[PDB]
Design a protein around this ligand. Structure first.
Ligand code: ADP
Ligand code: ADP
Ligand code: BGC
Ligand code: BGC
Lengths: 370, 370
């Protein structure tokens, strides 16, 4: 019932997408959107239905050549098919990319993609000047988190891990029910570690960050961090510990050549099945994710930290174990500033139902942009 | 003759302050302002003159009990002694405090002051309801940096240390002549380490930060950091290395008993006279300030970093020495992410002319609240 709460995202073949857009229901203003990641991209169009409902259909391309410029071919092969009837309806064009974006127009460099995303190189049919942008992925995600809060459906998609000291101080509503009137640190651990701060005051503004790339501070783990360092030939950062390659590293350190190396996916799958080794590796992954959160808790003074992404949803098992959850909490407050209770001010929440926040975010940004 | 470019800040005894406010020039809407430090507070009133000129009149109080609640007594004294005709011109009331502030109404805890700053406990005579705010010190400082920029006199108060790679890419104007359309990170190295991020985008918002309280990551200084740690019985943060107490530590470590201990002030004075030990101490302090800078250049993606405060202007001798500057620049770039050029994107600037940024920010903000 609540306005904006119906959010449908359907993935189709390019042909099916094209046929879908010819149906009478899609004779409306179109926003082109693209959630471009390291390995795949979902590109498509979004319209607003009845009851402020959000209707999206996208096609997934593979980022095989690992080159952010590749997507220009995608845009072009899309413009190749679609009828003029459809193309005239495009009112805005917004994409997100997995790297730092400046001026909303130049993205990169990327850790795992070649090149630089350039809005000025994109086809104006999909990217109308004055109504177009490149967002960073977690910037897109933050607009998405905002959109979900505005559609009154926050507790449908996010679960409370633990409510911090400060929420009671400034919120009339229950935690997890709305984004809240306070800063929101949005974290997404996957291939990389994304972070964005939704800042609030006289009201919500999404500010892109790169916390993952900060040098990782040693606590009582000089040896662990020096092992990774000799492997990477670099001073480890947070992402090195909290990413796919991170989880794989933790797993290797646990088994010590007693079992074959597994991918991030395999390790998590093993953990969901109660494998001791994989569970140990997941705890370490999560120990360092709580270190990201403890320091950002100090540095950014957020009201809430919200963990997002398919990996979070899919890892629900890890978070629902009350023992895992107690130890993460303990880790989240393991900072010298906690003596003043800064780490305990913060409420942690985790995405609990699947939803492409990034596309919701491009669409929303696309509204603002026209 | 540029608009807003006259900024006079007169510090007077309270009686002179009272007399001043009686003069025809001060019959005008007033903002009560207060720049409340850990050792003293300048509190008074600001008005706008011809050509958007800014005229502030403040009095100094010593923070004698080291208690933030003590300022309420100062507020009351000020009301007691002020003419009632003056009190009715008060449109807004804004102070800043050396600590994090939530909801613009509750401030602290503080490093060297007891208690908590409560807007609700302040007299409405000086803080009119709905027109009043407690700012963090660098929050205020950030607004003051904006004030200077809008007044077209950025180049009068700030000097370019080095222009980053990104400036010429998005800025027609010379580095140092404008704030710039891009994030500005303000750092105020004093008794503590202040930080605030001036974010930009359709326009400028000031986001308070607590970067100094983050755990200091070890590079090749495990032993140095462990030495500090054993003295503090805390894992060191940035502010432990880059503060008054940090500078004193750096000096003690240089001299190794061969010389009596000196205060931060004594050490910078010795440095200005060319003492070798104090210059070494000052080099180490600025090495850690550069680590603050290289990590936050990554994390916050600023276009510019701006070192502010009396200390900074007063230490100009340190920044003008070309070997020191070159050393600082190399240090600002000593990060693993510089292989992607992130640290070299950033332009560094330092305040080169004395100016109470905090009071200017309290005023700028009090314009928003009235
Ligand atoms: N259950 C899991 N938990 C943690 N990490 C995972 C899991 N499954 C996969 N990963 C890692 O995360 C990556 C996918 O994360 P995702 O956010 O979906 O996409 P990307 O980060 O590539 O845009 C995988 O390539 C793998 O390295
Ligand atoms: N030239 C200097 N360089 C660095 N630090 C200094 C210098 N002179 C004094 N200090 C230290 O800085 C602090 C005062 O700085 P300031 O920012 O003006 O005030 P506060 O931070 O106490 O509000 C004191 O702790 C003092 O010991
Ligand atoms: O994809 C998540 C994150 O991975 C990081 O390595 C990139 O630098 C970020 O910009 C991105 O948000
Ligand atoms: O006074 C400068 C800084 O000192 C720090 O220790 C405080 O926590 C900050 O809020 C403040 O900006």
């Amino acid at each position: 019932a609540p306005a904006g709460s119906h959010m449908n995202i359907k993935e189709l073949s390019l042909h099916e997408l094209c046929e879908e857009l010819k149906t009478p229901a899609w004779n409306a203003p179109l926003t082109f959107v693209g959630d471009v990641g390291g390995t795949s991209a979902r590109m498509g169009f979004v319209r607003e239905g009845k009851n402020d409902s959000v209707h999206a259909c996208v096609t997934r391309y593979s980022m095989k050549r690992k080159d952010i410029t590749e997507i220009i071919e995608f845009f072009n092969e899309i413009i190749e098919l679609m009828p003029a009837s459809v193309m005239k309806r495009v009112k805005a064009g917004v994409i997100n990319v997995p790297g730092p974006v400046t001026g909303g127009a130049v993205g990169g460099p990327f850790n795992n993609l070649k090149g630089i995303a350039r809005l000025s190189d994109y086809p104006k049919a999909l990217f109308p000047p004055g109504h177009s942008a490149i967002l960073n992925d977690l910037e897109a995600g933050g607009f998405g988190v905002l959109a979900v809060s505005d559609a009154h459906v926050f507790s449908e998609y996010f679960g409370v891990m633990w409510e911090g000291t400060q929420w009671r101080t400034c919120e009339q509503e229950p935690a997890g029910s709305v984004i809240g009137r306070g800063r929101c640190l949005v974290l997404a651990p996957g291939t990389g570690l994304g972070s964005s701060l939704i800042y609030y005051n006289p009201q919500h503004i999404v500010v892109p960050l790169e916390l993952g790339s900060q040098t990782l501070p040693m606590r009582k783990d000089i040896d662990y961090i020096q092992t990774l360092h000799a492997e990477l030939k670099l001073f480890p950062n947070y992402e090195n510990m909290v990413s796919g390659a991170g989880l794989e590293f933790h797993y290797r350190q646990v088994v010590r050549g007693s079992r074959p190396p597994c991918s991030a996916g395999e390790i998590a799958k093993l953990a969901s099945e109660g494998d001791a080794n994989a569970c140990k590796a997941m705890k370490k992954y999560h120990e360092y994710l709580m270190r990201v959160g403890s320091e950002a808790s100090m540095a950014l003074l957020p009201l809430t930290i919200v963990l997002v992404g398919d990996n979070i949803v899919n890892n629900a098992f890890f978070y629902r174990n009350p023992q895992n959850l107690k130890e993460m909490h303990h880790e989240a407050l393991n900072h010298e500033m906690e003596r003043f209770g800064f780490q305990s001010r913060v409420s942690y929440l985790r995405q609990k139902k699947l939803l492409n926040l990034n596309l919701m975010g491009c669409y929303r940004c696309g509204l603002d942009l026209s």
